[PDB]
Amino acid sequence: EPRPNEECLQILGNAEKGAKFLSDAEIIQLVNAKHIPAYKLETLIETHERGVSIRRQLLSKKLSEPSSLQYLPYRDYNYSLVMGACCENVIGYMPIPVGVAGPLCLDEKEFQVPMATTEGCLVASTNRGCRAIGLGGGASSRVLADGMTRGPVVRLPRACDSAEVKAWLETSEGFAVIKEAFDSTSRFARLQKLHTSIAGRNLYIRFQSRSGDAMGMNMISKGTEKALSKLHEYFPEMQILAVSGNYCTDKKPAAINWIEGRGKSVVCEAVIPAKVVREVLKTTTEAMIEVNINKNLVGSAMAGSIGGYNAHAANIVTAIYIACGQDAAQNVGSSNCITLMEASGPTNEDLYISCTMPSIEIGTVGGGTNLLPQQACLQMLGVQGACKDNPGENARQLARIVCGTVMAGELSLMAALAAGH
Amino acid sequence: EPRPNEECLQILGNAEKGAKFLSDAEIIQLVNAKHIPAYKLETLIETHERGVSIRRQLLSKKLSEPSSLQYLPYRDYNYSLVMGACCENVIGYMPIPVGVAGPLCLDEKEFQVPMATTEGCLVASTNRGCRAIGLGGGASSRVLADGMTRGPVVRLPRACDSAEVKAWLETSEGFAVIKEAFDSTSRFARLQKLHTSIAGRNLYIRFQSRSGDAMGMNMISKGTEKALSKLHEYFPEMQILAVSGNYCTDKKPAAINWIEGRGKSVVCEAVIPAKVVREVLKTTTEAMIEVNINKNLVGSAMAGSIGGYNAHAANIVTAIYIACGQDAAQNVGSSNCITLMEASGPTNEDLYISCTMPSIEIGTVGGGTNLLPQQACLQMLGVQGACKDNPGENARQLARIVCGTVMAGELSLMAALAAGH
Amino acid sequence: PNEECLQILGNAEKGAKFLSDAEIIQLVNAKHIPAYKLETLIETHERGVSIRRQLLSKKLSEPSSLQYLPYRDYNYSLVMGACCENVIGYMPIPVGVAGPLCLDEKEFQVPMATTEGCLVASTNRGCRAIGLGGGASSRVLADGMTRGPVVRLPRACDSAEVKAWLETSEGFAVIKEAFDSTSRFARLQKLHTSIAGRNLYIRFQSRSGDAMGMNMISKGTEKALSKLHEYFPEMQILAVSGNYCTDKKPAAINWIEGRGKSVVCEAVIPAKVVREVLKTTTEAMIEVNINKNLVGSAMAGSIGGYNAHAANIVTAIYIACGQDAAQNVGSSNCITLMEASGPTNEDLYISCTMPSIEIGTVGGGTNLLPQQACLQMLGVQGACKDNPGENARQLARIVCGTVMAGELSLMAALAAG
């Protein structure tokens, strides 16, 4: 019954028929005969999963092994929340095993932390650290700063002019004018002190603001564009070269994030009694400190590290981020961490530990946190979506949990390194 | 209905009954008030999936919102390959949308690149970069170096002693003995030149070797332990402080990975016709160059970046890594990239572009690549598993694809920023 | 004689002036007089230096080592008890001149203290291409010396509490008052702080008139922290410098926040001047600048070293002008940019940006007269009464401009090959 191209095409152009009245083979025949662009399937096909299905069938016949997608799942997933929002040219989804570490005893609460990973022993090891913390009387944490950033680059005709623009942005009245434009774009937009850097006739401007419970890239970028249109009214010779001049800095290693912070800056701490260090972690405080000093400080220093003074913060950050619908590529900077270990108590046998993470780039609204499975892991922690009565409290609480879980991970791994084998 | 626990323990310890004869609520009554821990539920329960269900039921009772897990899926997933290998305390899986970006024309072949992301526009943006590359005669790439590392820290009583060890490791005879011990642990263990660094009585030793198509952490760590054991025979006063002293460096930013490389060092390039830059990319060669210089070089430099001279290599690396079963936490170093752009061709109006990525930590055997869904994405690229006839070729080919896709991604985002929205 | 000379020292009116070199030395070597009691006894300075040298020479494996180390006819009254100790002489560093440097409508003759052959010549040629291109323009973007003490509290909860308190309007005010009350020029600008667990690193920043500022800022810092201790008695002042300043070590914080004077400088060199003076083209200069000072420094893992040889110029000027040459570590931070300019993109636009020039025209080695002469050549010696800090700012601009002259010349030579 597969009809000729010309007949299939009239059915397609017929608005009370459409693709729903053609078979997969007929649509594919139309695509291979160059009557439909391979990507405009998503508009023509009236169901999301069939769109995916036909794209897979088309993709398959181009591969060296036609059956390579057999075990890539696609059926019965909620593509409604993904198409035109989270992903394109969708051919399925990738299941990432989710484990749980906890309870994490943090700020007199208890958290069951979801961790999506394929690295064996990471969840178990993280769970052991949680245990040491819990029996040690818990951890305490504080958010020290909060504000996503965007660092556009603009160019003036001369460096004397860029200098003029910088000095102008630093006057109370010049800043206030830029602040008004930025803050007008959203209810959470609240431009903080500006940070600028001249390189010749370039000027890098680092816009920073809270963003409620959203991670904030989009909002900040909208506030930035409006802020710059306003600056351009005062300086019409200014050229806006790029809305991002890598001065943010987003998803690249950069000392500015380490020193100034980006997103949430957090510190977490705990004192593990000697007894717990022995029974849970199978070592002594002395051996843990000797390793922390010579690995996480001296080792990282010999390797030429900026911000990597920790054992495996990235493991925890990455696992939580994938689980909780974060942007996993932001683990580059969000993993920044210095882990400190000191002797405590009357005989120096208790272990004071802290982790400091100045650039946790996190959110509980928007992006991947819109998807229901990701929301389940957020609900687990009690941080899903916006916080009505105290905006930001859910993103802040998630950042504290990330730092606290990183600390658990540091305890366990460092203990294992200290003992051996 | 639930019966006394003592009777439940007879039924469980009975070899021809087991947990199958007990109820959900019965297993749970036994977990509460001890007898079974919770993680050993797997090594105890009839099926993997029922272990997950029991674990979810236990977890749910501890949460402030009992229905939190409702949309976290878990049924019909292949847990057999996960339990004891890739994750612990498993409560389900996290679906990550997977899109396809291609064809990527690389080294006179074509690749359909799977990307697992929740960032809107990322896959479409990358696909546009692939298209511009495709129309410009395609991309070329080369693997420059290959060797996973591990960087233990050892201590001697004095710095004069650590110096003696460093000097002995630098003789031909000293290295040969260490190499023999290292190489005996595995067929792929072939120790390359040692890199050593002293900090007083500390000595950091960076062991480097290829590892077939495996990412190679496990294998190198194994080789390192036997090498250090051999070294201790010659220097009995040496203490091995930690098998990783952060000198490797794994999952933390470090100039050593940027300078010496880690895993695969790759370069990719292409020339995009001036016509394509206008039609496909909506900008000019002159505009692309000016953005690249002032964003990816000058901007990254003003930010204090080591290795982050790029627009968003982390986006592409992260998405390929999740889709293909890599360790996503390694995006920290694997994202290291310098993107360069200049004028090319007769008119000098065509865009030359290269991406250099010195530390792509990757593999097609082990960890997450043992799972079937992530194997499907590896099969798309033709790089699933070990290459019998040419060990390591698959992992090398995957690194080349990553670098090329990164360049595609760099091309499209840099155009969008250059066009000004 | 041993006992006869002892009676001469003890007589308040006589003194060691009535003794010879050999006599004092006999006293020390027989253990009649402790050797450390020579600064106090000997009344004159050059003779002190001379006796110290003679005593020292007997302990060297070559007693004639100091033959050619000069020490005579130098003003040790401005050195003793201020700039140097256990002084045995002075080290002459050749001073050459590069100029005229046409900077902000003025013309400077820049003194450069060095022993590297061709450095003054090359820098001179840079100045010459700048002069034939219409001069250079510069601006001071910021000014403020820092000191970055480390304090600790019993817990990270406590350090976080202190950090929030210092960020309140009221808390800053109280700290600013204690800091500002130590000196006329001490005016505390915003604080920059970082927590590392129960540690708190506090970066105090302030202008300092025409002085480099180290001492002044360090005294203001101490009184400020004393005030903080009244609000937080559990706070331990671990060290007045916790390396957060950061002084005399490489540090991204100086590169990003600045330290001392942050400065920019620029110029345009006509195509003809690049060919005839610099022996290259604009196209070649740009090419080398991109691939050496940006890409090359990037491949080497540089923070703040995006330049050819700013350190050469900074160092030479610093030694000549009585600066703390050790501060060349941070003061040399520099990014050099080069792009095409003019009608047919044939002119060379150049700029240097130096965010952490640590500098002064008053205090320390700028108190010595030879150093003051070099400062006077530039017209920046000492404090500016009508506009505090102006002489220090001017010098910073001259360093940045001279650096640019140097980059122009050296890059031209590298490009020509």
Next chain:
Amino acid sequence: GAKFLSDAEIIQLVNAKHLIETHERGVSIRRQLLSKKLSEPSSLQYLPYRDYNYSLVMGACCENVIGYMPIPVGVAGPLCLDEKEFQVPMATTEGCLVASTNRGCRAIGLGGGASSRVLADGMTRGPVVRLPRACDSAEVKAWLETSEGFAVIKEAFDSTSRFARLQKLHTSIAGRNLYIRFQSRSGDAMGMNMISKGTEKALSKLHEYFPEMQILAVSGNYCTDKKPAAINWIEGRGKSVVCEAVIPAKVVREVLKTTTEAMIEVNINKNLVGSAMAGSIGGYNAHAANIVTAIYIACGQDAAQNVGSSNCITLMEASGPTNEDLYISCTMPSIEIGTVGGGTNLLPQQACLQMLGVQGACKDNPGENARQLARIVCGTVMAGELSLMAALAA
């Protein structure tokens, strides 16, 4: 000749757009010509120039010479280092620097002295070349990594001078660029000129094999010379040195006015954690640069190389039976230094080198005087670290 003219007459000849037979008079006449351009022409009055030996300076160390700058020189010592005693000259104008370093020497002396070792030794130059394509630059890297490619490059490099002896190459690609780090010992000279000449002929030989290669610049900043760079910290440059000492508890208390415990706490939290929060690469120390700079000016070194030469990590630990003694070490991977050439050619500079017993070439073992000076520098840096850190902890 010019002797049969006057100062005013030669100057009148120079102004009219139209040589002298004594060096000191050339300097006088240059000062007088320059005086005409300054707003205060009497500013030069107290810049000395008389009775200095300009014969070794002109056409070697400085051009357009108008005089010299006296820098005060103090002595820190004795420094007990590797069973010898050194009287270290330090040229500085920073009050207390020499007195403080001197206290550190004293503490080291009373703890049985310091021990040092040179871990690596070779000056570098890091040219940048480009090739048509990244594929061609990759091919050149592969070629340079073969034993046969390296041998031909080595032969070419080693032909340029006595001491040219090429060690392992280090390379990095950036697209069609290739950065090639050449490393070699250079006798007792710092060696820049020697390595640059060697590098030129090596690159010339490379061009024979790869005709499409362009030599963009003899230094592509990959060396790296006189700029901060992680490559020097990780690979070393010039002399890599380590030094150490154990200071008895009693001596930490009586001389340094503190305790081993307090010293350790400040070192960890200042030199490690603080430098780390500041974003430091290689600056894990209190003030190595004060010492390096002071010794460098006094001993005729290139003071601009304090940028890389000051790289230092200072470590401190508890030591001894009762864990009350202070183990201290400093590690300096990139001391760029020499005892022949440059400012070491001058007699006053040679005076300070002779105090140390390292002046000029070591005829027995070429390069041994430079190694010794690096060891002394690392030892004196450790002295300075000890004292300043004790002052901060106290």
